[PDB]
RNA sequence: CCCCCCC
RNA sequence: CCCCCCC
RNA sequence: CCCCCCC
């Protein structure tokens, strides 16, 4: 007599299926990774500055040094706990200081270089020697403030800021990620670029993208570093910049939900189309799923969690087309590559959005 | 004198 | 891997799912445990996507009935359809009960 | 039928992400700073006037 | 010291002033399309305390 | 990225 | 008996 | 399958 009992709620059921599991997945049982204890923080910060102020032949392990600084900031055992909670059985190998040899330092003791598992000593030694040679050449040419030295306390945060820029585009492609990182770091990291005029952003960004791809648990470690940095009472300008970029990375992989919220706020009349009305129930279910997951829903695609994909609006072609049309009408869409199912709805929504933006009204 | 730099 | 033979691997999987029914339960538990992990690879996200696409299998008529209601089909108002909607609501209530 | 379920609340989620952390950041592990005990208050006040 | 209080957030204070000034251009459709996130920022201020 | 006035 | 499409 | 813009 009434069609009120015809209701399914499949997305809630799929989320309940996925989340309510009594068995944990075990991955990377035989793999190992390296961390650095907080005591070596100084000895990593200095090295973190050596990648910046010299031209280096290779930048394979810059991202690993940034992650090492993250480990020093959080603590080695806390990093073990982070990696274990991420679903990985990776075993930490501990960073160790080793004497280089007969080489003597300015303090009179043996020159102690860092030993990081998975990073060959040749790369670290070459970085150290190249940075020292660049410093010697600069001193010979001209005779260097504190903020232009590798020992500056904020150099690891600058390296990690390049890392955070590449992190923001982890749901995009590697070429687009590198291009956006270079373009944004020319402006975002402009003061650091003036202090260190020969830090090679493209290769450091490439190293960070490689690290984020090979070691997925390092995404979780990076997110925990951002969370722990955002909860501190004080910090430097570099750390505030890092947390700003990190928060800019938040809703990555879910720009369609944000553009749908924008389209609703834009009062697009083509949302009233009967094709769109026929599908809005599942759209509301997706948004309700976001509310159910809560704050951690935004980090789903960044963490590369398999549960991501429940938030997809790809089974609402009318809603997606109207949302993309509204995005194009306001000029927001840019070079978004999201496919447009229905071209008629896209064009109509674009026309209405251009009409609304070009015109002005008072309420 | 490369390794004697202040750094 | 340009020489992985999809038809025979798929045939083997269908044979396994037919002979050993408990392996269906094992597969479902693997999907559930993979969907609950914090991180994962692109392959694992793909697996959970296909696994969730498998969800309502065998019950496409219920989904199409929900679609027909959302399509505002006027022929749902037919007296023959009205005479039977009570049991349809009972089936959907059973779905809600099972969860 | 209605656009009521389209709502995101991203800023609340970002604040909840930042504040609800079980790990503290450790900075300036090897640095030192100077303080003066209250007994020397007079001896600092005079210098503060100099 | 109390004059130093709201430093770095003068835009929030000027927004409160603009609301108290009854600026009619706040009723502009472009402004109306964004006031939800502005209210969210002010709610965040209330949350932090 | 953010910030930027006056008292 | 049930199931049966597409992604 | 999903994702894909800008800051």
Numbering used by the authors:
A (entry chain A): 1 to 143, 146 to 365
B (entry chain B): 10 to 16
C (entry chain A): 198 to 296
D (entry chain A): 1 to 50
E (entry chain A): 248 to 296
The paper states:
The viral genome is encapsidated in a sheath of oligomerized copies of the nucleoprotein N, forming a ribonucleoprotein complex termed nucleocapsid. The nucleocapsid is the template for transcription and replication by L, which is also dependent on the obligate polymerase cofactor, the phosphoprotein P, together forming the active L/P holoenzyme. In oligomerized and RNA-bound N (N-RNA) the nucleic acid is threaded along an extended groove in between the NTDs and CTDs of laterally connected N protomers. An important function of the C-terminal domain of P in nsNSVs is to bind to assembled N-RNA, forming an N-RNA/P complex.
We incubated N-RNA preparations with a ~ 100-fold molar excess of synthetic peptide covering the 9 last residues of PCT (N-EDDIYQLIM-C). We carried out 3D reconstruction of 10-mers, 11-mers, and spiral particles of the N-RNA with PCT. In the reconstructions, additional density was visible at the periphery of the NTD of N. To facilitate easier model building and to obtain improved maps, we carried out symmetry expansion and local refinement of a dimer of N-RNA/P as before with N-RNA. P binds into a groove at the periphery of the NTD of N, between a helix and an extended loop of a beta-hairpin of N (here denoted as NβHL). We observed that the density of NβHL becomes more ordered upon P binding, indicative of a folding-upon-binding event. Lastly, viewed in the context of an N-RNA assembly, the PCT binding site is located such that P attaches to a region of the nucleocapsid that protrudes at a far radius from the helical axis.
